[PDB]
Design a protein around this ligand. Structure first.
Ligand SMILES: COc1cn(-c2ccc3c(c2F)C(C)(C)C(=O)N3CC2CC2)nc(-c2ccnn2-c2ccccc2)c1=O
Ligand SMILES: [Mg+2]
Ligand SMILES: [Zn+2]
Length: 315
């Protein structure tokens, strides 16, 4: 499988489309691994990784996403593509090591997801929660990333120096942990404060980490930034996963919270409106403030919000 990837060439008709924030990978499943190779090559250079190691790595990542309704291989590549578009539109700001780390972090950020929230795992004293008390799944995702990197023929970072290697692994660690949405709220609030007091300073590593964390959230949530038919379908996948978790609670006779209850289906449009207003709009607003070229994400998020309003109002 990995050898045929080495030969892959992105069809020329997709060379312009892939640069756009709203690009939907949906119709191109057999190309997803090749699309990631393409994005790495354009963003980090063709001399960045040894091609064979990169190809082995990508295929091992793919195999370590489970067949769940939403946190699957499709989501991994979708998030990686959003990061690509952010990086391509902010060419001066990030280092070569950051561009490498962040594309890899995005592809890996939900590795071996089981379709359960951290809350679920903690409540039922699952072994992963016994191991990782906070940001439970995210620590697991990073752990899985490191395990794949340490496989024979998979160390894509083998040709970095000792210091550069630990640096990129820390970029990846922080970026994956930042995808714990519980951490986003505080991160965005701190960034908003720093922005408006004019103290935000990208020479400051801790400020940089915060900006990278917000970029990670923005990429992770980017299904809300696609054209309406794409966004609407992805919402189906998201709730399928919410409801499957709810169903697991019902197996103990336990009534789940509304968001995870398939019997509360009629409340979905209102639920989405609430989520866009409370989470997605603030995310892309703050991101656009810090990185003006990301504005198309906010524009697309606003468009989908108005679509959900129309659904609620029966228009
Ligand atoms: C209602 O509709 C939606 C609700 N959520 C949502 C999710 C988790 C949590 C919450 C949410 F709102 C709250 C309630 C804030 C919460 O505490 N968690 C758990 C998390 C803190 C640790 N996400 C999406 C969405 C749109 C795009 N990607 N995702 C997404 C889907 C699954 C997981 C994460 C994000 C969505 O569409
Ligand atoms: Mg996650
Ligand atoms: Zn994710």
């Amino acid at each position: 499988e990995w050898q045929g990837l080495m030969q892959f060439t992105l069809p020329v008709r997709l060379c312009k489309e892939i640069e756009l924030f709203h690009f939907d990978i949906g119709p191109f499943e057999n190309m997803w691994p090749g699309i990631f190779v393409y994005m790495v090559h354009r963003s980090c250079g063709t001399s960045c990784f040894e091609l064979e190691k990169l190809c082995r790595f990508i295929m091992s990542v793919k195999k370590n996403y489970r067949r769940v309704p939403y946190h699957n291989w499709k989501h991994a590549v979708t998030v990686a593509h959003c990061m690509y578009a952010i990086l391509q539109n902010n060419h001066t700001l990030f280092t070569d090591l950051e561009r490498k780390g962040l594309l890899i972090a995005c592809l890996c950020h939900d590795l071996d997801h089981r379709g359960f929230s951290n809350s679920y795992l903690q409540k039922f004293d699952h072994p992963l929660a016994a191991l990782y008390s906070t940001s439970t799944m995210e620590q697991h995702h990073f752990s899985q990333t490191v395990s794949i990197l340490q496989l024979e023929g998979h160390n894509i970072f083998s040709t970095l120096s000792s210091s550069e290697y630990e640096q990129v692994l820390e970029i990846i660690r922080k970026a994956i942990i930042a995808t714990d949405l519980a951490l986003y709220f505080g991160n965005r609030k701190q960034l908003e404060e720093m922005y408006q007091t004019g103290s935000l300073n990208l020479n400051n590593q801790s400020h940089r980490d915060r900006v990278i964390g917000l970029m990670m959230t923005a990429c992770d949530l980017c299904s809300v930034t696609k054209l309406w038919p794409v966004t609407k379908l992805t919402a189906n996948d998201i709730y399928a996963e919410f409801w499957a978790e709810g169903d697991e609670m019902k197996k103990l006779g336990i009534q789940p919270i509304p968001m995870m209850d398939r019997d509360k289906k009629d409340e979905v449009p209102q639920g989405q409106l609430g989520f866009y207003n409370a989470v997605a709009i603030p995310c892309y607003t703050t991101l656009t403030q810090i990185l003006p070229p990301t504005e198309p994400l906010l524009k697309a998020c606003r468009d989908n919000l108005s679509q959900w309003e129309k659904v609620i109002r029966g228009e």
